[PDB]
Amino acid sequence: SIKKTLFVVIALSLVCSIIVSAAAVGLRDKQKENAALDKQSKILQVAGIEAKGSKQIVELFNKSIEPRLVDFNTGDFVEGDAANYDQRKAAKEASESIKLTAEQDKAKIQRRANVGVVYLVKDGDKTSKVILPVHGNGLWSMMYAFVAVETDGNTVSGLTYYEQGETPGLGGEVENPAWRAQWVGKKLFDENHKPAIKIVKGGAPQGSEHGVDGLSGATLTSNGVQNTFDFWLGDMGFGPFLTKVRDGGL
Amino acid sequence: MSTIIFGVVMFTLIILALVLVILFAKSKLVPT
Amino acid sequence: KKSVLAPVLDNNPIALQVLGVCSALAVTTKLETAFVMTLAVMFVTALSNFFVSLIRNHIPNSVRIIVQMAIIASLVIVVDQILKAYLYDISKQLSVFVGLIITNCIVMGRAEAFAMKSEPIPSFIDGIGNGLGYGFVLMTVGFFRELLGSGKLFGLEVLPLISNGGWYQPNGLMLLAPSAFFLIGFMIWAIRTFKPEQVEAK
Amino acid sequence: LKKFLEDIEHHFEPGGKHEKWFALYEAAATLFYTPGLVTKRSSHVRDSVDLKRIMIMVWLAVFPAMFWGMYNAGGQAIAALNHLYSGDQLAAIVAGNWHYWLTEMLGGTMSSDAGWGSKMLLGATYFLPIYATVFIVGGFWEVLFCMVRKHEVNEGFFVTSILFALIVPPTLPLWQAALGITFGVVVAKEVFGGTGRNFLNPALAGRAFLFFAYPAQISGDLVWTAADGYSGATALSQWAQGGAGALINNATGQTITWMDAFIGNIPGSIGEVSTLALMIGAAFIVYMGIASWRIIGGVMIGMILLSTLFNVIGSDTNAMFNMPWHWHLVLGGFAFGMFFMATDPVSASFTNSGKWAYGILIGVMCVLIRVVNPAYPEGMMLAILFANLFAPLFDHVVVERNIKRRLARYGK
Amino acid sequence: MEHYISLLVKSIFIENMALSFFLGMCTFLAVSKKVKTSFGLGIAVIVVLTISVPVNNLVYNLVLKPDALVEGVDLSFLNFITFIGVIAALVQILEMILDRFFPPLYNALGIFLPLITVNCAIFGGVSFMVQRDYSFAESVVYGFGSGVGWMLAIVALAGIREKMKYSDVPPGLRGLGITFITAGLMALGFMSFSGVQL
Amino acid sequence: MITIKKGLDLPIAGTPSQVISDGKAIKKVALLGEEYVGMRPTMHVRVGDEVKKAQILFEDKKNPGVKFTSPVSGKVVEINRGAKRVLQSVVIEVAGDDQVTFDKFEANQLASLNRDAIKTQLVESGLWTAFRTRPFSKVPAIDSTSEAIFVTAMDTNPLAAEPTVVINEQSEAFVAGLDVLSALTTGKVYVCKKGTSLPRSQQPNVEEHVFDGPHPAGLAGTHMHFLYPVSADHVAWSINYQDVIAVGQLFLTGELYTQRVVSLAGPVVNKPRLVRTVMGASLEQLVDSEIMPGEVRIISGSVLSGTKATGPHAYLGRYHLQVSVLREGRDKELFGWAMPGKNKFSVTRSFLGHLFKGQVYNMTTTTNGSDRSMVPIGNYEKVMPLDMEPTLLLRDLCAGDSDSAVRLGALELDEEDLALCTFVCPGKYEYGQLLRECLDKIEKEG
């Protein structure tokens, strides 16, 4: 009884474990590249690069995009494994992130990683754009976006929200191509270099350097978008980094 | 293949521990 | 052959046996997740029944559940690893419900009720049949939820949304959980209208 | 009329050529004349009250709210139109919308000096099509279910239809109103067997369908005033943004006083704005014994306690924390739901002790959703639907205590 | 205590396991015929969930999480087999304990244990705990709160179904069909808490 | 004193004058077979047979040993039967004065009589059927005992006779009957009355309790709920005051006492008054020449709980002490449900009638509406004085859930206890019939 019970359990466990372990280890490398290619495809899209096949995405990402670490406090580049840096995981660790106060936490993120990752879009050997990952709390969930900025450090080249959970008809319009097209050509800062991008409720004026139309019937999500850019363009975000970029960096 | 070997050992040991606990509990609780 | 098609309408796992309800509510927001979940449940149920029937004469009764869940979980782990490697986008949408295939009442229900007392080949057929009935509900519910909540089928635009210059305003409630309860309930009303023998007595 | 009804009676009785329409015939014949039936068993005499009179008193009790709502809806629309447009631009707007030029065709005016007749007429053009669509679509479902199950049409749909029409924005599309009433009548009421056999409020279940299925047409700043191109927040939305100081009517530039909200000079749902009109209607049905004062008392107790608790706690970020109880009373659909929707006897608790707990739960939930839920400025519909789920549970607690007393022979 | 109290309220009303994540529906729809039967099942779910979540949290953090035993070895692929194995063992042990020393408890809780041995509600709660990376104290609060929320939903459904003794459901919807519609209407009410960022 | 607040007194016109007068000569009487709960008759007589007074007519199969005896001396003329051959009535035409005699005692020794001797004399005389048990409102088994016997010395029914007038005429018989009941019971005797003085028994186990308030203050079910709660293991007996008088006459004179005093009343009665009559008297002959013209309904018992006395049922009931006559309300009114209702009575305040407090109503048999589902506007709680949840109990009766109804107190109730609930029901449910079906199901499975 006991001998038969243990023999069956041990034999069954060994066979199951071997199949499970082989599948988990053999497929592990392909699993981690699928996660990478999902984000790499999104960064290529916001940068304005056409890529359809998985191989095409990999070759274009390596050729055109160079990830680099940036320290938020100083605005200087930091040496590290940029392609494998996880900013979200670093934001949840006390040794690699700072807790924000009520005054500073405009976007309601409650924490901020010490060092972030930016993506330099290079045409050959000269940087043409910089991709800044920003995030801020919406009405229902945290919203993550990529914003493409020209080398002048003021002009927006494109925007793409790649992770949001707002209502599809109200708030989910952050992914609407028509709304995203409005961000092209806008200026992030005024002549005093203060953050000046504004989400205008009821529709921005047609000729405007800083105004972007708000989401119809979605004032709360629009406030989340406005707070997101207010924080990340401030001194606590990419403020000093964009100040150095506009001075002749990159 | 250290991960595979560790996976095989831990998978067997976890199940064996669960089986032994149930058998010990049944022997010490269920009347006979 | 009749054993394959019996769990579709005569003995439907969800409409009659009240098994597998949890996944039917969650994953049916899209046809792509409903189709993948259908294949995964059909794959796991058929193989779990097959392997359990092979060793049905040696499973100790004291730890019978542990032995059965060791086979069921191992198959689901392999399915989860494969989905992460080849269907990463769909696997991310399925979230925790890939793991919940282990606790799906259909998989354990058929393994205990049928596989323990049947030959492996009929057990494999029984698992395929119950997967077809389970999938029939998932695809039917997923069809209405996706078409009426997004105007799309498998991501292909069938009804042009007004936000994209179309004419159809998507129904927000179809993307919310209460619609899944309603659709299943009315689906049962339709099945038992054409199958009066399934009507519960008062 | 009476002779015609008697003559055609044999056609709808079994064996006649119109047997399948028997349900419709009794709905019409009994509508005009009493059935003329005598008792068959003990209690050879009966009380004069029946379901028809109970439903008709509630239906009449909302008439003051209905008429003021049409007057207020027109007044808000006309004021906003003259705030935005003038001269030829206003003339083009009037010609482009059939509500506006129909009002001017029937002797009314869209000018800023329009009288109460023009304002009520403009509100009528927005409310009557909604009420007609709700009545016809809902009535078809009620009759169809009764014909299939071979039962007489029970009363209560007149209350459901008029209440649903009064709790929607004046700009609601007609096709959405048809879908909303269909969900409320069929899913919430008819699949359970009709009047008296459901557990969920039918009118609010229909409104919850529109709330979540098509939130763009039942929320925001574009649906509460029936003026084309006019964007304006309401008092609950404005208070959530900037507290008491933010209550400004942009159509006229005047602050929203407490008396303005109490009388009903505010935008919102058609029949919810006037708390005074709802009080008059509620007083008549509470006095008649149709509406339960225990439920109404419980709602007030719940709202007063929780709102006072929020005021004492205070918040330097959420302005909804400092709203007093009397501001909660006169804003939103609190008064409408408390007087005419929380008092639905079928959806409420069946015990007097349960009714107090049922009412308190509604009052607590309504204030909670207003204050600590940022997505929704109001929570009365959600509060009542939530309390409909626990209404049987309150009864279960009460009866189990009663059974325990009985098993002890009531103390012998 | 505000952090733990906030988590407790979040797991009961904001993220109710039965009416916001809809796990365990099979036993939820079936056993909800009677209030006392549902009340007994709900307590059993609370006890199993309050024990299973903290134990699996200890196992995951000490063994299965990356770099737990040996640096560079990730055994997270064993999560599924380990979690259900612990749950399947603890439930069976409770049957052997209650039926032996506490016959009154075995009638009250033991008779419902076989149903929830592999129920989706227990496994789903453990999976959510791993995703959210709770601590041990948070695991106890989350496990207890999830069970209370699950018990609250099934008892509320049981009271509704007992009230429905007077209903006139059509034969096609009688039984399972009307129960699905009832639970869908209950989901609408619980959406009142949706949007509360607690 | 126990005061009842919840309840309703019907202000129906035609109240009787509380003066006893001689009634019409009654030429035939009958015993109604359907008014006894669970009674399966074994006939001991045939058509044409001549029967003596207090001679057994039929026996009960389901209650062995119980004898139903003739109230008068005469000839069996007809044995009416209905659907499934149910015994409707056994009619005897009055002719002669032959009778069966029994033992008679003195008033001093009545309280010391043996219980078996008392039971034997009551059963043989047929007076044992006056007792009804609670629960189930059945005639008690001859071998059973009760620790509580309730004497209904009051009547709050509409148009009911005042018990004070009848008891004062038969004070000696009433006290003698109480002494017999005191020896019969193993516990106590509860004489439930109003504040008016009544003749008193000197026995220590006979207790007078005063009940005040509107209907149903006078019902035996209300008295039991407040003095001796009943259940499966606590069975009480009830008996009305006029039957207590008959018990006293039986043990004092040795002869069955079948005289009754019933109130003849109602809107269509020309002279409402108390009339002397006999048990089971033909209501067609009693009511002859007493009613205004038109289609009328004659009711044995009260309007709230009584038997439609038509055809084979046109005889005074065993437990009925009044005869009510009403018009048949067949008129159809145009928008009658929406009228202000100056002359319409209601427990609610939806009509102008309640604004006139001193108004009496010529109530007819109209239903005032069609049958509908129950919508609980709270009318039941206003008329139910017992510690029950009326709305939830009534839903169980409509749903047929006998087990839940028992837990909610259905065993403590009779049909008359739910008469007010039937009256005020907006959905026009008849809860008396539903309760009896639940009680029949409970007994069958017991």
Ligand SMILES: Cc1cc2nc3c(=O)[nH]c(=O)nc-3n(C[C@H](O)[C@H](O)[C@H](O)CO)c2cc1C
């Ligand atoms: C005082 C009162 C309030 C009512 N309130 C509502 C209501 O808010 N919504 C509704 O659909 N029906 C309402 N009704 C009608 C009816 O009672 C209700 O639809 C029931 O749910 C029908 O079973 C009400 C009826 C009364 C007498």
Ligand SMILES: COC1=C(OC)C(=O)C(CC=C(C)C)=C(C)C1=O
């Ligand atoms: C107010 O009471 C009511 C009626 O008459 C008085 C109805 O005819 C009807 C029936 C209506 C239709 C459309 C058949 C209802 C529902 C009702 O509530």
Ligand code: FES
């Ligand atoms: S499928 Fe989840 S409990 Fe059955």
